[PDB]
Coordinates of C-alpha atoms and ligand atoms in Angstrom, one line a residue:
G570 CA 258.9 178.5 -55.1
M571 CA 258.5 180.0 -51.6
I572 CA 260.0 179.3 -47.8
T573 CA 258.1 179.6 -45.3
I574 CA 259.3 180.6 -41.2
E575 CA 257.4 180.1 -38.1
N576 CA 257.7 180.2 -34.0
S577 CA 255.1 179.8 -31.6
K578 CA 253.3 183.0 -32.4
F579 CA 253.9 184.0 -36.2
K580 CA 254.2 182.5 -39.6
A581 CA 255.4 184.1 -42.8
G582 CA 255.4 182.7 -46.3
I583 CA 258.0 184.4 -48.5
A584 CA 258.3 183.7 -52.2
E585 CA 261.5 183.3 -53.9
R586 CA 260.5 185.6 -57.0
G587 CA 261.6 189.3 -55.2
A588 CA 262.0 187.6 -51.9
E589 CA 258.4 189.0 -51.2
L590 CA 256.6 188.3 -48.1
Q591 CA 252.8 187.2 -48.9
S592 CA 251.5 185.8 -46.0
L593 CA 252.1 186.5 -42.3
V594 CA 249.8 184.7 -39.9
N595 CA 249.0 185.6 -35.9
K596 CA 248.8 181.7 -35.2
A597 CA 246.3 182.5 -32.2
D598 CA 243.7 183.2 -34.2
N599 CA 245.0 182.7 -38.2
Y600 CA 244.5 186.3 -38.6
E601 CA 245.9 186.9 -41.7
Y602 CA 248.0 190.8 -41.3
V603 CA 249.3 190.5 -45.4
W604 CA 247.2 191.4 -48.1
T605 CA 245.8 188.0 -50.1
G606 CA 246.8 189.6 -53.7
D607 CA 243.2 189.2 -54.6
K608 CA 243.4 191.1 -58.4
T609 CA 240.0 192.7 -58.0
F610 CA 242.7 195.5 -55.8
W611 CA 246.0 194.5 -56.8
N612 CA 247.5 191.6 -57.1
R613 CA 250.9 191.7 -55.2
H614 CA 251.3 191.4 -51.4
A615 CA 254.5 193.1 -50.4
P616 CA 257.3 194.1 -52.6
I617 CA 260.9 194.9 -52.3
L618 CA 262.1 197.7 -54.5
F619 CA 265.2 198.3 -55.7
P620 CA 267.0 200.5 -57.2
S621 CA 264.2 202.4 -57.9
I622 CA 261.1 203.5 -56.3
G623 CA 258.5 204.3 -58.0
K624 CA 258.6 205.8 -61.4
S625 CA 261.1 207.1 -63.6
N626 CA 260.5 209.9 -66.0
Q627 CA 260.1 208.7 -69.6
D628 CA 260.6 205.2 -67.8
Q629 CA 264.5 206.6 -68.0
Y630 CA 267.1 208.0 -66.1
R631 CA 270.7 209.4 -66.4
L632 CA 274.2 207.9 -65.0
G633 CA 276.2 211.5 -65.5
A634 CA 275.8 212.0 -69.4
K635 CA 275.0 208.5 -70.0
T636 CA 270.9 207.9 -70.2
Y637 CA 269.2 204.0 -69.3
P638 CA 265.8 202.3 -69.3
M639 CA 264.4 202.0 -66.0
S640 CA 261.6 199.8 -64.8
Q641 CA 258.6 201.0 -62.7
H642 CA 259.1 200.0 -58.9
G643 CA 262.9 199.0 -59.9
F644 CA 263.5 195.4 -60.7
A645 CA 264.8 193.5 -57.6
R646 CA 261.0 192.3 -57.4
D647 CA 261.1 190.6 -61.2
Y648 CA 263.3 188.2 -60.4
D649 CA 264.6 185.6 -57.9
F650 CA 266.6 185.4 -54.5
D651 CA 268.5 182.5 -53.8
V652 CA 268.2 180.7 -49.9
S653 CA 270.4 180.8 -47.9
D654 CA 271.1 180.1 -43.6
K655 CA 267.3 178.5 -43.6
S656 CA 266.4 177.8 -40.1
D657 CA 262.6 177.5 -38.4
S658 CA 262.2 180.7 -37.8
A659 CA 264.7 182.7 -40.1
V660 CA 265.7 182.9 -43.7
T661 CA 268.4 185.0 -46.0
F662 CA 267.9 186.0 -49.3
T663 CA 270.4 187.0 -52.2
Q664 CA 270.3 188.1 -55.6
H665 CA 273.2 189.8 -57.7
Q666 CA 273.2 191.4 -61.3
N667 CA 272.1 189.6 -64.5
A668 CA 272.5 190.2 -68.0
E669 CA 268.9 191.8 -68.0
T670 CA 269.3 194.2 -65.1
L671 CA 272.9 195.3 -66.6
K672 CA 270.7 196.7 -69.4
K673 CA 269.1 198.9 -67.3
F674 CA 271.7 199.4 -64.2
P675 CA 275.3 198.5 -65.0
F676 CA 276.6 197.5 -62.0
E677 CA 277.3 194.8 -60.3
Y678 CA 275.5 194.3 -56.5
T679 CA 274.5 192.1 -54.2
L680 CA 270.7 192.4 -52.6
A681 CA 270.2 190.7 -49.4
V682 CA 267.5 190.3 -47.3
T683 CA 267.7 188.1 -43.8
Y684 CA 263.4 187.4 -42.7
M685 CA 263.5 186.2 -38.6
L686 CA 260.4 185.7 -36.7
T687 CA 260.4 186.9 -33.1
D688 CA 257.9 187.0 -30.1
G689 CA 257.5 190.9 -31.3
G690 CA 256.6 189.9 -34.9
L691 CA 259.3 190.1 -38.1
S692 CA 262.8 191.6 -38.2
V693 CA 264.0 192.3 -41.9
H694 CA 267.4 193.4 -42.5
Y695 CA 268.6 194.4 -45.5
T696 CA 272.3 195.1 -46.9
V697 CA 273.0 196.6 -50.7
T698 CA 276.6 196.1 -51.5
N699 CA 277.8 197.7 -54.7
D700 CA 280.0 195.1 -56.1
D701 CA 280.7 197.0 -58.7
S702 CA 284.3 199.9 -59.5
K703 CA 281.8 202.1 -60.9
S704 CA 280.2 204.1 -58.1
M705 CA 276.6 202.9 -57.9
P706 CA 273.4 205.0 -57.0
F707 CA 270.2 203.5 -55.5
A708 CA 267.4 203.4 -53.9
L709 CA 265.4 200.7 -51.7
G710 CA 262.1 200.2 -50.3
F711 CA 259.6 197.7 -48.7
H712 CA 255.8 198.1 -49.9
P713 CA 253.8 195.8 -47.7
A714 CA 249.8 196.0 -48.2
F715 CA 247.8 195.2 -44.6
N716 CA 244.6 194.4 -44.6
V717 CA 242.2 196.5 -42.8
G718 CA 238.4 196.5 -41.5
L719 CA 235.8 198.5 -43.3
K720 CA 232.8 200.4 -42.6
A721 CA 229.1 199.1 -44.2
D722 CA 229.9 201.5 -47.4
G723 CA 233.3 200.5 -47.5
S724 CA 235.2 203.0 -46.2
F725 CA 238.1 202.5 -43.7
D726 CA 236.9 201.6 -40.8
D727 CA 238.2 204.5 -38.2
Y728 CA 242.1 203.9 -39.0
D729 CA 244.9 206.2 -38.0
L730 CA 248.7 206.3 -38.6
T731 CA 250.1 207.4 -35.5
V732 CA 253.7 208.3 -35.1
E733 CA 256.5 208.9 -32.9
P734 CA 258.7 210.9 -32.2
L735 CA 258.0 213.9 -34.3
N736 CA 260.1 217.3 -34.1
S737 CA 257.7 219.4 -36.2
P738 CA 254.4 218.8 -38.0
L739 CA 253.9 216.2 -40.3
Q740 CA 254.6 216.8 -43.9
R741 CA 254.4 215.1 -47.4
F742 CA 255.9 215.4 -50.7
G743 CA 254.0 216.9 -53.1
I744 CA 252.4 214.8 -56.1
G745 CA 251.9 215.7 -59.8
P746 CA 251.2 214.1 -61.9
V747 CA 250.5 211.3 -59.9
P748 CA 252.6 209.1 -58.7
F749 CA 255.4 211.4 -59.6
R750 CA 256.9 214.1 -57.3
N751 CA 256.3 217.7 -57.8
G752 CA 259.3 218.8 -56.0
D753 CA 257.3 220.6 -52.8
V754 CA 257.3 219.2 -49.0
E755 CA 253.5 220.5 -48.1
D756 CA 250.7 220.4 -45.5
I757 CA 248.7 216.9 -45.1
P758 CA 245.0 216.8 -45.1
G759 CA 243.6 215.8 -42.1
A760 CA 246.9 215.7 -39.8
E761 CA 246.6 216.3 -36.2
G762 CA 250.1 216.3 -34.3
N763 CA 251.0 212.9 -34.4
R764 CA 248.4 210.8 -35.7
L765 CA 247.0 210.8 -39.2
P766 CA 243.5 209.9 -40.1
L767 CA 243.6 207.5 -43.3
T768 CA 240.6 208.3 -45.5
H769 CA 239.7 207.8 -49.2
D770 CA 239.5 211.8 -48.8
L771 CA 243.2 211.5 -47.9
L772 CA 244.6 208.5 -50.3
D773 CA 242.2 209.1 -53.2
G774 CA 244.9 212.0 -54.6
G775 CA 247.5 209.1 -54.4
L776 CA 250.7 208.2 -52.7
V777 CA 251.0 209.8 -49.3
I778 CA 255.5 210.1 -48.8
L779 CA 255.9 211.3 -45.1
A780 CA 258.8 213.4 -44.9
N781 CA 259.8 213.6 -41.6
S782 CA 262.5 211.3 -41.1
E783 CA 263.2 211.7 -37.3
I784 CA 259.9 208.8 -37.4
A785 CA 261.0 205.7 -35.1
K786 CA 257.8 203.9 -35.0
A787 CA 254.5 204.3 -37.0
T788 CA 251.2 202.2 -36.0
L789 CA 248.4 201.2 -37.9
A790 CA 245.4 201.0 -35.8
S791 CA 241.9 201.4 -35.5
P792 CA 240.1 201.3 -32.0
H793 CA 237.1 198.6 -33.5
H794 CA 239.9 196.3 -34.9
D795 CA 242.2 193.6 -32.6
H796 CA 244.8 193.6 -34.5
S797 CA 247.1 196.4 -35.4
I798 CA 251.0 196.7 -36.7
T799 CA 254.1 198.7 -35.9
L800 CA 257.1 199.3 -37.9
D801 CA 259.9 200.3 -36.6
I802 CA 261.4 202.2 -39.4
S803 CA 264.0 204.9 -37.9
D804 CA 266.7 203.5 -40.7
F805 CA 264.0 204.8 -43.7
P806 CA 264.0 208.5 -44.2
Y807 CA 260.7 208.3 -45.4
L808 CA 257.6 206.4 -45.1
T809 CA 254.9 206.0 -48.0
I810 CA 250.7 205.3 -47.3
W811 CA 248.7 204.3 -50.5
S812 CA 245.5 202.7 -51.3
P813 CA 244.1 202.0 -54.6
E814 CA 242.8 205.3 -55.7
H815 CA 239.0 205.6 -56.0
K816 CA 238.4 201.9 -55.5
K817 CA 237.1 200.3 -51.9
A818 CA 240.1 198.0 -50.9
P819 CA 240.6 196.2 -47.8
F820 CA 244.2 197.6 -47.3
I821 CA 246.3 200.0 -47.0
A822 CA 250.1 199.6 -47.7
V823 CA 252.3 201.2 -45.1
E824 CA 256.0 201.5 -47.0
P825 CA 259.2 202.0 -45.7
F826 CA 261.4 204.6 -48.5
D827 CA 265.2 205.0 -48.5
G828 CA 264.6 206.7 -51.8
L829 CA 261.7 208.6 -53.4
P830 CA 259.7 208.8 -57.0
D831 CA 261.4 211.5 -59.4
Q832 CA 260.0 214.5 -59.5
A833 CA 258.2 215.3 -62.6
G834 CA 260.3 216.9 -65.9
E835 CA 263.5 215.6 -67.7
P836 CA 265.1 212.4 -66.9
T837 CA 267.4 212.4 -63.4
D838 CA 271.0 211.9 -63.0
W839 CA 270.9 209.2 -60.4
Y840 CA 274.0 210.6 -58.6
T841 CA 271.5 213.5 -57.7
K842 CA 268.4 212.4 -57.6
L843 CA 266.8 212.8 -54.0
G844 CA 267.1 210.0 -52.1
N845 CA 269.5 208.3 -53.8
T846 CA 272.5 206.7 -51.7
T847 CA 276.0 206.4 -53.4
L848 CA 278.1 203.6 -53.0
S849 CA 281.6 203.7 -53.5
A850 CA 283.3 200.7 -54.8
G851 CA 282.8 197.9 -52.3
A852 CA 281.1 199.7 -50.5
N853 CA 277.4 198.9 -48.5
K854 CA 274.7 199.8 -46.7
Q855 CA 272.9 198.0 -44.3
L856 CA 269.2 199.0 -43.2
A857 CA 266.6 197.4 -40.6
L858 CA 262.9 197.4 -40.0
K859 CA 260.7 195.5 -37.6
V860 CA 257.1 194.8 -38.2
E861 CA 255.4 194.6 -34.6
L862 CA 252.3 192.2 -34.7
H863 CA 249.8 192.9 -32.4
Ligands
CL1478 CL1 229.6 200.5 -40.0
CL1479 CL1 237.3 206.6 -45.9

């Protein structure tokens, strides 16, 4: 079950399963911006990450003194969303808890995602609502993989991420053991002011989680390639770059994060887990982004 939206410039395909964007096409030349899910490198396209990003310590966590199991990448991506408010250029997907999610995460919730194509590209609005009486801690991320050109030898063809604004040098969360965090924030191999060259040398050591929350726009581009994209992500405190390690995948993921993978060690209380947001009963958090399609 899939839904398409479109306007004069663009078409998008979104799976009801995980409200997962799977395709985003420039109609003028039929260019595909989003990874096609070739299992040679990675069999997904752009999952939603909720209520956890990344891996959990010993695949579990705490709520105060109680322990629960948690799957890597959360579980929203594993269940269908209902479709509503469908027009030619926009659509809304909504997921609630189920008996399975309640075993991992004992909260009633609503996760709503609205996609809309505009002249600029694709707008995405998220609303996370705590439908429980208990205080609900969560993380929310989006994990799109974008097609990129490669050199004769399979290296990335001179792609950089350019960011703005930047009020201090670019920093990343330290990783160890991949893909968990080690707890530090550190300098990034090869960063030059607001420009980060995206190389296998950089990415082979695992995901690069930018710590600079002031960033409003992040552009993935190469001077040798016509198409680029820019992520408008002021609402998302962190931004992660990833490509399959020690492989020559023809994609780079640029992933808005409202949360962080666990710091290595013992299972973490989600009420104090770095990057988590705790919602009061009945409260909601809203986050927006845009993928500008150039
Ligand atoms: Cl070349
Ligand atoms: Cl490279």
